[PDB]
Each structure stands twice: as structure tokens, then as C-alpha cells.
Amino acid sequence: FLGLTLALSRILEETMPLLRAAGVELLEDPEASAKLIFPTSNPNVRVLILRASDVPTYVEHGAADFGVAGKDVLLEHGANHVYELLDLKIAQCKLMTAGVKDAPLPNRRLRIATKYVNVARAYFASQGQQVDVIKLYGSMELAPLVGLGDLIVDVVDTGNTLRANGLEARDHICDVSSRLIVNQVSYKRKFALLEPILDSFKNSIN
Amino acid sequence: FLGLTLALSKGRILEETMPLLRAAGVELLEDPEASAKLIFPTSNPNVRVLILRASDVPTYVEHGAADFGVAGKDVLLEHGANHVYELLDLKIAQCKLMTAGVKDAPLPRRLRIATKYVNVARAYFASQGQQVDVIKLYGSMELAPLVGLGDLIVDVVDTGNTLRANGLEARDHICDVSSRLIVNQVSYKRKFALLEPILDSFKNSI
Amino acid sequence: MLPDGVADVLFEDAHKQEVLRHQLTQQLITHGYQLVSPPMIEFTESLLSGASEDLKRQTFKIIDQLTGRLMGIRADITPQILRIDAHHGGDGIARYCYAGDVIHTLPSGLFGSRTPLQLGAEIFGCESIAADIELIDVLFSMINSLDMSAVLHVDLGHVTIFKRLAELAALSASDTEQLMQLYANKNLPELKQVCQVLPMGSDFYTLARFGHDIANLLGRLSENAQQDTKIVTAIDELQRLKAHLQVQWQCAVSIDVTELSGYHYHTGIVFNGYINSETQPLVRGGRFDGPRQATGFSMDVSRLLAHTQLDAPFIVLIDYDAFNNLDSAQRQLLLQQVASLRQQGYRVTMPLTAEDMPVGLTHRLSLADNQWRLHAV
Amino acid sequence: MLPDGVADVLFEDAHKQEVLRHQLTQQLITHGYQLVSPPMIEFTESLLSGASEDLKRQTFKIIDQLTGRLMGIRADITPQILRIDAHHGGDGIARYCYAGDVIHTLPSGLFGSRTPLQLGAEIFGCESIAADIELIDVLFSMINSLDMSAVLHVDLGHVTIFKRLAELADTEQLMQLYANKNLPELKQVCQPMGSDFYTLARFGHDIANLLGRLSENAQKIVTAIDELQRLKAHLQVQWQCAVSIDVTELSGYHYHTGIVFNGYINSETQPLVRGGRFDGQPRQATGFSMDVSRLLAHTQLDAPFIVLIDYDAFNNLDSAQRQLLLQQVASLRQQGYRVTMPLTAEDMPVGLTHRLSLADNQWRLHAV
Ligand SMILES: Nc1ncnc2c1ncn2[C@@H]1O[C@H](COP(=O)(O)OP(=O)(O)OP(=O)(O)O)[C@@H](O)[C@H]1O
Ligand SMILES: Nc1ncnc2c1ncn2[C@@H]1O[C@H](COP(=O)(O)OP(=O)(O)OP(=O)(O)O)[C@@H](O)[C@H]1O
Ligand SMILES: O=P(O)(O)OC[C@H]1O[C@H](OP(=O)(O)OP(=O)(O)O)[C@H](O)[C@@H]1O
Ligand SMILES: O=P(O)(O)OC[C@H]1O[C@H](OP(=O)(O)OP(=O)(O)O)[C@H](O)[C@@H]1O
């Protein structure tokens, strides 16, 4: 396969338009599909549907030439080995600390439970606070309720999920949006295929 | 809660432990698979159930946010299990950990392994005296070999259907896998009076 | 199992590395570079004098039990050459080469080595770009002598151009961090927007959008920029060096004036040498401070192993049973012959037993009718 | 400026080390030893597997940040050869050589180096003393090839003799006394088979009659005393080498499985060469190693030819004239002349011997 491989994961739903106006409308509708690799209107582009967590991995190793990854994922994973070409300004949420509603700070070293371990260590370091961090893979809202951690680091848009689970947003860590990332080799060797899709996206977000 | 907190995973484990729990005197009130609640009561008011992602059960137990859990040996081996007691083999969710590559494709150079099961991979290929580059994945791994992110994946297989359906074939057997009953080390010392009946009933049931 | 980024180099690979390390060393020496062999360990006071944060984090610390003082296992030989030049170099031109093991705490690139075999050359005490052209000449003699099918492409940059655009336009640390991140990520749109806000912003967007075309670049720059002689000379150096590489070595040269890595170490022209489509440069060179003018390059010799081939070895077994049937004088004669074959570089084994079998045997040395001769297996 | 036992090797010494390291490596390779280049660092699990207390204490520990596991900077390559042979060696005879930097926490002996350049050869899978005779022959061809004025004296020992006196009849006590040649203290401390233990110390040197001096009971020992005699004579007959014997040389008690060789240059305290039998199925093995840096003092190369192209003349050349002088200079470097294309009129190489000068359309070398 001599063309571009695109790594996508909400994001599929919000990139469809960007892709439509770039000339890359998917054949099938993944949400109801068993296929891993997906063709598209452009026969020089294929799409990999991954878990958001994995998109930066596939791109960075060149199993995908470019991907749409949340800045949450990039910050946690480390974007050292990919180019961040453009901020798509989609999936606009934020990374925040969250604890139990009205619950006070304990008289002991803070214990953070989260999938965003590196983000947690980094944030609380810049606040000059010493934290014990616990890695989680699944839903994190339970962790404070059973006292696995005092706080969680998660992505929050409105606040509904936190509140519905008895949790309240504490500290704002940073803003988050889907970013277009590119493999370093792919950018040099397949730029002729990339430039039109990049120029269309730059156009689309304006 | 002055009583026992039980950490289960939804789907297969929950489905295959229900009978063991019924005969132990712990039948769930609600039916989780269709529910939004994180913590679940039961026929015994001294037992509650946490529904977690399988990946996290050993974490919640080891830190004492759950007193005991049902975890796959796959998860225990990968996570470590240094800080919990493995009291009995429930002989449910019987699958195996295996290497898998593309069908009839041979091993190439230094292998690149893509998997969720990184520590298992490093450990296995070490005992084979084989030198490997390991790539962490979070989502389904069947795509990784097809786009050449890895030469092999390490995954759980029962029959083989999923691998074949994705153009992959099971290669090497790493070890047998089943749900194991794990206990928090403090909980076992402090709440044994509550545990003994449930343990004796399970030992009986299997 | 070995730690990530640590590998055995065994058998023919080891022989090949031995041959590379040695051929490249004598080449550098024949070009008038003085071989220096600094130690693997020093006190951190000397080893990390003027080090970056990247170099400090990359250097393993150990305690000197004799004195209680902190030492490091070098992650880079270049600073040791500085210490050596300061002591012995004098005020005039001085040339040094070196090849040595260095150790990194973390890998450079994905599954990259932590034990690179670092080979390099440096020229101290010459302002002229002539010294940069000399390093290019030595580097390319070395590379051509390896008879590789792999092609080296050279990226030229010049940190001076951007450092000057930053000074003349009085950029805040904040702003400079912004542009460098945007450059490093090829973010043209993000950069275009940000430049409409920044002073001389048009210049910063020009380096990104028109830097590749060096021959016209000065003409595209603002009156202010074109007035500054540091920028004029910098853009001149790139031209002189670019042409020399194409004309003299038939080298594909690209220009990237937004190549600002080693911002703190680099004081001017920077050359990066890429093998094929490999992400991490094989060769990292350019101008750096010592008021002692200095320029140099280094490569990980171990990264050449993949792109170099030696002729198959002749691996030879003396026939055990035949040799033992020989009288004393017959043995002296066969030993004189074996000595001759080793002179020629044949790998010959005097067998301890009838079963003693060398790895990858090619030939036995066998007796037939009063004559010892090589016979393929 | 540098820590004790840590030196630069600079300029002609560095070139000379480069030449030694290389000549000795290809010598070993031409005798059928396989070059292996193990790394400076390993996890301690592998690097110190079966290590002595001396080896552990001599090895710098460092932290792998990727895994949190302990690594070491090797103080000795020999154990890495074992690991390599175990993996690739098979069960037949196998030969390895190596050269590599090793690092010690503390100096070996008085004013010893902590950064020796370790060069060595090992033979695995042969019981016969024949393999020890092969190592001796290879070592002595290597040493003779250096055309040194310095003489190597070889001390032979055999740990088996004492290991047997120990079995057939404290150990740390005698070894301390032996290690210090403390005869009176040893004589007293002799009072099971005590007479034998004091005899090894007092009569070890005279190997030819030593068996006769040992207790009838004590008379492995027979063959051990034989090995020493075979090796001693071989070194005198074949290499005209002064050989002394010390059966109380138990330095490497933990590693050494039989015959041991130490090679001393002149009257220097620390051995230049440390060799003998060690274990590596019950896979037999023998080897030696030396610090290549310790040869630098006793080796001389031919003076280098260091050449300056005339700056003024070179600049006067048209393009085609420059192509031709470059072709000539390329030829001189092929021959090993060290030639400088000068950047300026003042550019002067260190230890200049010859200028390349233009006279009547011809470039020629002239001594300064
Ligand atoms: N509430 C939200 N509003 C906007 N963007 C969001 C929100 N939650 C997550 N995102 C963005 O989408 C990404 C995750 O996508 P999504 O939530 O659809 O899948 P996911 O929950 O990560 O699924 P999986 O369990 O397979 O990893 C995040 O990295 C973030 O950039
Ligand atoms: N095919 C199988 N047959 C039997 N047991 C299995 C099988 N696959 C996995 N298991 C076991 O059950 C666990 C998988 O739990 P589960 O099915 O919930 O998967 P998960 O990865 O946690 O998430 P998901 O709900 O997406 O499947 C593993 O830890 C393993 O021990
Ligand atoms: O309503 P808000 O508080 O603004 O945030 C909505 C939540 O949904 C997101 O996951 P997603 O929608 O993918 O849920 P899923 O992982 O269960 O699919 C994310 O985890 C947010 O926490
Ligand atoms: O032996 P096989 O029949 O090929 O099954 C093996 C599959 O079972 C597991 O999936 P699971 O059943 O948990 O489904 P899900 O992870 O897709 O929900 C696992 O992820 C394997 O892909």
C-alpha cells in the first residue's frame, strides 16, 4: 500500500466533516463494523480505527503516516517522535483534578488515581506538591468513592459525568483539543499526498 | 462499609462468578450490564460489589479499596500480584496466553512485539533467550501485525476464531489462564471471619 | 536479557566494527587530526562544565570511593576534547579526533542505542568557514571509503540567522519558545497567525516558508534583517557549504534554517547527515564555542554496521591427524606456511583434537603428495 | 583534575594504543579466536551471576530508569564471555577474543589504573592441558610481535593442589597468611595435615620435588603437580621464559579451577597478564587478559611522517592543479603519511617532519 494510512479513534464523528471536505469520506460506518482497516473515496488514503490511547503509537512507529489524537493523549504519551502539524479545534475539553463533592484535603500525602499518570506527576510537580500516583485503565470516577485515591485526573467538558458520580472539578491543568500528528519519515517522503489534505483541513477549521 | 468489598469485571467474569456467589449467599440486587451505578449491594448486607475493567481489579484489591477480587491470571501475571494473596483457582474464564503473527508468514531480524501484555512478553521471550523490542498497546491488537507495527502480538485466545477472523494464527503457548480469587493482605488478617464462609463455599463450588 | 538500547556485537559484526573503528581512525589521523583517548569516567566538575540540561540528565552518576566526590560515565566525548584543547591546544589552529564508548541514561530515538560507539573530529582556532569545508572533506573521504549502497543526505542549518531575527525583533523568552515549538512541528498555519502579532513576524514566517531556497532567502528578508551582516554572512556560509557538498562530493543538500536543536551549544552553521530514510541523524556537526573558535562532527560507528559489508572471511582448519603424523621439521615448515596465511589475514586454527571445528569453516589445510593446500568444505 | 587511577591517553600514545589494540586483536583472530564485543553495561542479574565479593565491590552500580532495575558498568569482560559461550558456544571447543574498556571502583594495586583497556582470549570445551599450551603460545607470539626490551616473567600456580589438601583435611586463615607470604605466623597456625599446608608455602617454588615432600596420604594432586611441570618446561624450552612456581597463589580462589598464570613485566608489582582455568553440562574453559594501556610504556612505533602542504603555493593553483595535488595527497595518506591541507599560512601540525612544496610544476616532500 503506497499511499497514506490515517489513524482515527467522538473524534470519528467530529473529523467526518474535515475528511469529507478533504476528499476522504469513509465507505462503511465503523461504529457498526468488524473491519480494522477502512477504505475511503480517495484510493490513496486508508483509515485505521484505534483506541485514542494507541493513535500516537501507530503514527510514531509509522504503521500510520498521520493521526488525529487528543492533546490529553499526546501530553500523557509524549509527542517527542511526531510532528504536530495543526490544532483541529475539535473535541474541545480540559484536563482537571477531581475529588468527592465538598470533601476536604487529608492530613497525609495526596494519592492521585488516573490513566493520566505522567500528566498528574507533571502538574503537581509545577505546583511543588508531592503526590503518590496510582495507574488506572478503566473508568476513574469510582476511585475516590472507595478511597483508592483522594483525587482523579480526567478530561471534563461540561461537568455532568463528575456530578452524576458524586465528584466535583477541582483544579484546571490545561485545555485539550484533537491535534493532527504526522510521522517524521511520512512528512518528508509523502508530503505530495499530505499537502492537499493539510491545506483542506487548515481551510476547514477557518 | 464495615464488611467485604468484592472487585469483579463486567461480561464474562461477572457472568461465570454469579453462580459461585449465589451458592456463597451473595446474589446481586440489580443486573449490572444494564446499570449506571459503580458500587452494587447484594443479598448479604456485609458484601458489596465493585464492577471494574479487568485490568484494574488487582489494583483496587492490592490498595484495599476492595478486600478481594476475581482477576484473570493474564492480568495478575502482567500487573505483578506481589502485594495480594491468590487463595484459589476458580477454573472459570479458561483461556491461554499465546504469541500470534500473520497466517503462514514466517518470523523475519530482532522481533517487535505489540501487546497489552508487555511484562508477560518481556518475561516469555527472555526465557526463550530471544531479543525483542516491545510496544505497549491499550486497544485490540489484531491490526498491529497487519500494518507491521509488530511482527507478533501476545493476547488471550480460547478457540482461535478471533485471530483467524483477523488473518492471524496462534504461534507459541506462553501459559494457561483462569480467573483466580485474590485477597488484600490486611483484609485476609482483619476480616477472615467474613471471608472463611465465602472462600469455603467457592472451594466447594469449584 | 540485556537492558533496552544495549546489544552484544558478536562474531562478524564485531570484526566489522573493529575494522570500521580502525579504518576511520587512521583516515582521521592521515588528515592531520590528533587521536585523543579520554577516559570513560571523570569528576562531574570537568565532565559537565558548561553542559546542557539534556547532557546532565543523559550522564550516569557514580561516587568516587577514594574522595567521596561525584563522577560521571561520559554520555559525550566532545566536552573532554574541550578540556584537552584548553590544556595542550595553544592559541593557534588545533585538530583532534577520537573514537570511544559513551553511555546514555535514556535512548535517543525509538529502540535507539544507549551505548553508541562515538567517533568524531574537531577543529579549534579558525574563524573561516574553510575549517567547516575541511571537516566536510574528511567526513566524505571516510564515508566514500566504506563502499556503501546507502546514500547520506546532509541538512544544513544556521542558528545565527534565527538568533539575529530574535535579537533585532526583541523577542521574549515566551515568544522564542513558541516559534521554536512551531518550527520543530512544521506548524505553518499556527506560525502564520502568531507572526501577524509578533514584531518582524514576516521574517520568522519566511525562514519556515522560504528557508529551503537559500539562494533567494536574503532578498525575501526585511530591510532591517538584510542590513545585519551576521545574517548576510550566515546566509553566505550556507551557500559556500551547500555548493561545495554538491560540486565536490555529489551530495544531495537540503537547507533548513528553522533547525534550532542544540540552540545553546550551536553558535553558527550546523550539518546533519541522514542515512537513507532513517529518522535520527547518523552525523551531527557544526560550530560551537570553546574566545576559542571550534567546529566538529561525531557519529555512532555502530549505526554504520547495518550499511557496511566485508568480504567473506577465510576460516581454515589444519588437518589434525595429518599434522600429528609430521616429523619436527615438517611441522616447522607447515607453521611457516600458516604464519604466511595469517599475514594474508586467513583465520587458521591449530586443532587441539580431531573434533575441534571452527565456526563458519570455509577451508581445511590438507596434506596430499608432499604438499599442504586449502580445500573448500 | 581527573580521579586517581584515571588518565587521558593523548596524541602519539593514543595512536600507539590504537595500533596495539588493533594488531593484537587481528593476531588473536588469525589464530581462530572469535572477536566478541559485549556492552559496557548489563543488569547485575547477568553481569555479576556467580561473581566473587572482589568483582561485586569493583563494579559501579547505576539505575535503569526504564525499568527501575540495577545495572553495572563491567569491571571485567570475562564473565560476559561465559554468558556469550552459554548462548552461542554449543558443547564442542570454542575460542573467543575481546578488547574493551572496563571500570573499577577502587585501584587494583598501588597506583593502579581504574580504566584498564582489557584485551583477552579464552578456550572453552577442552580438558587437555593442550588448550593451556595454545593460550601460552598465542600470548607469547603477541608479546614477541611488540619488539619490547621489557622481559615477561611468568608465575605458575595450581589452586587444585590446595583445594585437595583442604578436602583431604581455617581456609580464610591460611589464605590470608599465604597471600601475605607470612611464614612464621603460618608455621605456628599449622598446629589437620598442618605440615602439608606449611610445605606448600615453604617448598612450593621447587615443584620437581614437591610431591615427595607431601604426606603419603595426600600423595588430583599428582596430575596438578604434573600440569605445572609440563607448562613450566614448555615455557623454558619453547619461549626461553624464566618461570617461577607458587602453589599458594589463591588470589582468584572463587574463579580458578586449576592451573593459573601471572605474567609480570620487569619488576612491576601488578601482573600485566592474568590467566588460567575456570568453569563454564560441566563445560571446561581457560583464558587470559591484559591491560593494553600497560604495554604503552614498553612499546615504540616508527616516528610518524607529519606533512604540511605549502599554504601560499596551494592557493596559487588553478582547479585542475588542485585536483592533481589532492590525488597526490590521497596517495600519501594511503601510504600512512599524516598530511594537513592548511587553513592559513600559520596552520602548523604538531611534530612537523616534511613540507610538500611546489617547484617547477612538481610537488615534492622536503624534511624541515
Ligand atoms: N467529554 C468530552 N468532550 C470532548 N472531547 C472529549 C470528551 N471526552 C473525551 N474527549 C476527547 O476524545 C478522546 C477520547 O475519545 P472518546 O471519549 O470517544 O473515547 P474513549 O473514551 O477514550 O474510548 P476508549 O475506552 O476506547 O479509550 C480524548 O482523548 C479527548 O481528546
Ligand atoms: N475467550 C476467552 N475465554 C475465556 N476467558 C477469557 C477469554 N478472553 C478473555 N478471558 C479472560 O477474561 C478476562 C477478560 O475479561 P473481559 O471479557 O471483560 O475483557 P476486557 O479486556 O476486560 O474488556 P471487554 O469488556 O472489552 O472484553 C481476561 O482477563 C481472561 O482471563
Ligand atoms: O459530560 P462531561 O463531564 O463534560 O464529560 C463527558 C465524559 O465522557 C467522555 O468519555 P466518553 O463519552 O467516551 O464515555 P465512554 O468512555 O463511556 O464512551 C469523558 O470520559 C468525559 O469524562
Ligand atoms: O479464542 P477466541 O475465541 O479467538 O477469543 C479470544 C478473544 O477473547 C477476548 O475478547 P472478548 O471475548 O473479551 O471480547 P471483546 O474483548 O471484544 O469484548 C480477547 O480480546 C480475544 O480477542
Numbering used by the authors:
A (entry chain D): 21 to 29, 32 to 228
B (entry chain C): 21 to 128, 130 to 227
C (entry chain B): 1 to 290, 301 to 387
D (entry chain A): 1 to 169, 175 to 196, 199 to 226, 230 to 290, 300 to 387
Sentences from the paper on this structure:
In Psychrobacter arcticus ATPPRT (PaATPPRT), structural and functional data indicate allosteric activation of catalysis triggered by HisZ (PaHisZ) binding specifically perturbs the chemical step of the reaction taking place at the HisGS (PaHisGS) active site located ~23 Å from the nearest PaHisGS:PaHisZ interface. Therefore, allosteric activation was proposed to lead to more efficient leaving group departure at the transition state by stabilisation of the negative charge build-up on the pyrophosphate upon nucleophilic attack of ATP N1 on PRPP C129.
Intriguingly, upon PaHisZ binding to R56A-PaHisGS, part of the activity was recovered. The structures are also very similar to those of the respective WT enzymes. The kcat decreased by less than 2-fold for C115S-PaATPPRT as compared with WT-PaATPPRT (it is possible PaHisZ binding allosterically disrupts a putative catalytically detrimental interaction involving S115), and by less than 4-fold and 6-fold for R32A- and R56A-PaATPPRT. In the Arg56Ala-HisGS mutant, HisZ modulates Arg32 dynamics so that it can partially compensate for the absence of Arg56. In contrast, when R32A-PaATPPRT and R56A-PaATPPRT reactions were carried out with Mn2+ instead of Mg2+, the rate of product formation increased, and the apparent first-order rate constants increased by ~5-fold and ~3-fold, respectively, in comparison with those with Mg2+.
